[PDB]
Symmetry: D2
Subunit: 296 residues, 4 copies
Amino acid sequence: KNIIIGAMTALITPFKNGKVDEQSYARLIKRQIENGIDAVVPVGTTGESATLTHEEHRTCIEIAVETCKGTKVKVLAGAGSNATHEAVGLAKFAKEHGADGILSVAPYYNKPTQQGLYEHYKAIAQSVDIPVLLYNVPGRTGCEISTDTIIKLFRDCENIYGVKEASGNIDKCVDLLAHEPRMMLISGEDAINYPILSNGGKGVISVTSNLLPDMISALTHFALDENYKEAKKINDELYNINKILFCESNPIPIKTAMYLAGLIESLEFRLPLCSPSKENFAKIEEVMKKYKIKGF
Amino acid sequence: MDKNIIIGAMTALITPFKNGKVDEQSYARLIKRQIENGIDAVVPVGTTGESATLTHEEHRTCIEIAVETCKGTKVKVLAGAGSNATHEAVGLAKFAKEHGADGILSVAPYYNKPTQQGLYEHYKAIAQSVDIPVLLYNVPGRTGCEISTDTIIKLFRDCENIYGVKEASGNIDKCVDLLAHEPRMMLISGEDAINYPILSNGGKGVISVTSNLLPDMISALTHFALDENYKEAKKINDELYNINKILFCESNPIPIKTAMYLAGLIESLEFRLPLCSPSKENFAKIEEVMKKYKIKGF
Amino acid sequence: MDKNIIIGAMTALITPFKNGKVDEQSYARLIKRQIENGIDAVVPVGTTGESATLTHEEHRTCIEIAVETCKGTKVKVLAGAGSNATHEAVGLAKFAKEHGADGILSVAPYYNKPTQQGLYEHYKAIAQSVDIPVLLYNVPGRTGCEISTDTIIKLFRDCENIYGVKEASGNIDKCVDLLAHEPRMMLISGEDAINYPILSNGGKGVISVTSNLLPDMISALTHFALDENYKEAKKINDELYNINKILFCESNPIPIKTAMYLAGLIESLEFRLPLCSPSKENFAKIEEVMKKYKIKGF
Amino acid sequence: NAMDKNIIIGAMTALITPFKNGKVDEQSYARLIKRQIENGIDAVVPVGTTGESATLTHEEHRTCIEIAVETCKGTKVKVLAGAGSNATHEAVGLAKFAKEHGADGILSVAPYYNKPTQQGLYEHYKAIAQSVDIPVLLYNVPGRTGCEISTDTIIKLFRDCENIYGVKEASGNIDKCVDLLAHEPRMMLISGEDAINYPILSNGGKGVISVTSNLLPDMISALTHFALDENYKEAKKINDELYNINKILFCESNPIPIKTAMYLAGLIESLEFRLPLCSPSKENFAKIEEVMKKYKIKGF
Ligand SMILES: [Cl-]
Ligand SMILES: [Cl-]
Ligand SMILES: [Cl-]
Ligand SMILES: [Cl-]
Ligand SMILES: [Cl-]
Ligand SMILES: [Cl-]
Ligand SMILES: [Cl-]
Ligand SMILES: [Cl-]
Ligand SMILES: [Cl-]
Ligand SMILES: [Cl-]
């Protein structure tokens, strides 16, 4: 198996005057690289994938690929869709523009059956020869990839190598690795990075690492090296920030934090996303004071 | 206040496929069948119509066919036009208008979970971009978000052409809340099994999946209720419960297309991935349930 | 079949405390006030009456006071008598009958989560133990289990004295399901905000929290609906929505007892732990909502 | 602070209660407890949910606690008696009752059915804790009670009451477990969900109150002891091996599946429950029967 594992960041997409701030994007990626991160995920949920155009999607993947060139950092591009023909197109597109692998979210809104999910991902995996990571996030999609479906896809499709789980369900994580220990289970929920890793998970795709790349990468690496004592210490230390970064829908809080930290110049979203309430803005600002935030 | 509205018995149209493409002649035939069986409006390219997997050109074709087929009749076209990206939703609204839609149905942003403030700005932008009626669509089970009663009411009061909401949330308490606080809006049932309860509380129409198969029955239920013939409306809602329930034994529109195929109303049981045929067990359950109903032909 | 029934407008009675004991004089006055304001039955020692924290002797006293206060009137006593242990629930049913109850309300077993087969056997045992009417009570948010439609219908058909169900599940779909398949049963609303929708679908009464405070309004709503005056019933249901909602801002009966205290209808705002007074903020919200309503004294 | 040091942790079993001809089978109960003791178990919990507390009489409650205390006497095994109620006055009475009958501590479930507020829950447990001088373990199980003890409430009770020493969590919410131990690392977090015993322990949890251990006490006790010694590799191996049985033991409401397994294993003579509990469906019975055949089940 070719795989992409370790500490990985779901990159925010900075905007300036309604456009992707391309210089800022490259600079943010360089900061990730210099702080121990193993891979970056351009144009996922945290990157406002829903509201980007196809050309902007291309631009972000290209910038990620170029910034990571000559480094150990890989690019796991977001490429999911709820239409199979579109997801196949996107997987091919990502590979065309130099991605090392793709993250492909379960179809949102149209609620396919397990058989549909199996055929969806089989089509995607067959369209490219790079690694594919499934992404289960039922609170956002309205559907769940069952354990049996994930395992069948892993066993049947050479390049499907694991799943990013964002379902708040540690029982499912036990189920997955007890039955198919060969897969790469990746945490998609920051607050529980340590519990997932301590049960044999092999990485994280993190929102929090946008702000604290050094701490998330340290946690992940400690855990992978079976230094559970030190990984847990960091996971506990991070709980407050990990929680507050979801006080409103991601990436509203993380972009607010990045702005407060002076890491992006404009606190700007594309509708229907918008700035947080004053109460939540103030909570985010206060929680941040307890952490050492690396600059550029 | 004096909004234009689209209400009454309405159908969320399925989209038939043939050899991987939209079967345009079948689509027209199905719409004419709805018209001839008492339906007041049709919704092309919504969820039941597999909007997620149609191309932009197909979206255009389906709307154009619906508009053309309804010409020379009272039947209105309420086009599906929602997106989870506000700039896209605005473009879809203008696009539907340009192609002759009488109004638009605009689903709450799915997957990206905007806040209420974001939902308000989303729909304000859409409503400002066209001069035709806009019906909000709340279906939290699919979208991952809910347009709150406060937000719906604020939109209704602030934007002239937002005239109501299609509710698909299995929450009759919310239906009471909405009409108690803002009795001028058009509340539209988006859940077939509870069509009668929504109408009897002051709802003014339905956007139905079941009416694809049984348009005459859904039409009668709605008009009985609008005329305050509640005993007759309830009787039909009760008779329809079994089919209303089986049409969601797998995710819509898998069961309704299966039923249309079984009834001989479409030629092939064909979907676009990630949708697919139902399990053999569910296929058989649908077939058995249908035997209790008189299904209008062409 | 021709079952004895207890239907119409009914009140889930609060239990007033004074110095840590049941205030028996207050209890009697509160019941007389319900009788004088058009209520058809009262329910002593249910959830709203803090049944969990009353002793066996207090349970006895409350039932005896309800029965005595209702003598010489048409008002019925539907006594709370459920338990999560079948042997206990049988004992409670016999006990309620012994002390003069006209029927019993028997909640689905809480906490131990029996299966449908277990629920069927539970209620079959209870119904066999007495010759008075038994009303099932489904409230999954409190019990952790749900009596399915099939189970309810099987019980109704198999056990002569089980005559229907109080539904408090926020699920109008299930109300449709129940009466579409078994129209002979008495469906009773257990959720005040949706009293009208349940009645307009053929429900035959309510067991209300709000009627503690506004008995004449709940009675009128119910009787308008039973006479098929749906416009008038809906008008009251809509007017009541604000109070109906605020009465659950914290777990019932915390808000209703607060409201009764604010209205001057009980002397002290006293609960038995683990119930306690509402937050300062919720106390203020309840007071403000009440200002819009006419409240009758004794 | 003596009390702060008095805890009951390690591998613990939520005991089933065997019936024979509608009565508690006292000989069988003693025998089953001895089997737990001889297979590495650190404490037993008589008359909890798994023991069908809801349907036992007060006299049967006393009998079960007495048998547990006597059987554990002279061993290091502790008795953590079920003593919760949704009425505070009753819960206080039950705590005193458990103490007077020799229990080492009590397990006290969050009030079911009546849905108290967090302030009510705090007052409920403060009353209970002040009534006895033995350890109290809170028990959060929202799917059964209809309420949840919030992290803030749990931490406040731990900080305010000397003898409230931790919480048994059965909420399938590992985030909450992180939250609890990140903010109050001195408490004893106890797993109440067998399938995730290892994840809870590896995050600093200090024991389990197990249903599965009724059937496989040796495997649950080995897992727990490995984890407490930071041999995570070996603890995880057992947790993984156990997943199939841990899952099937909840195919219907506990203790329906565990009693079915005990019966099929010959560890109790009859598959008998008190209503409203009853035997499982034919489908689930068969699933339980087949899953068991992959495990080694110790006899007496
Ligand atoms: Cl499925
Ligand atoms: Cl296996
Ligand atoms: Cl903004
Ligand atoms: Cl604000
Ligand atoms: Cl099949
Ligand atoms: Cl007696
Ligand atoms: Cl069941
Ligand atoms: Cl307060
Ligand atoms: Cl609270
Ligand atoms: Cl703290």
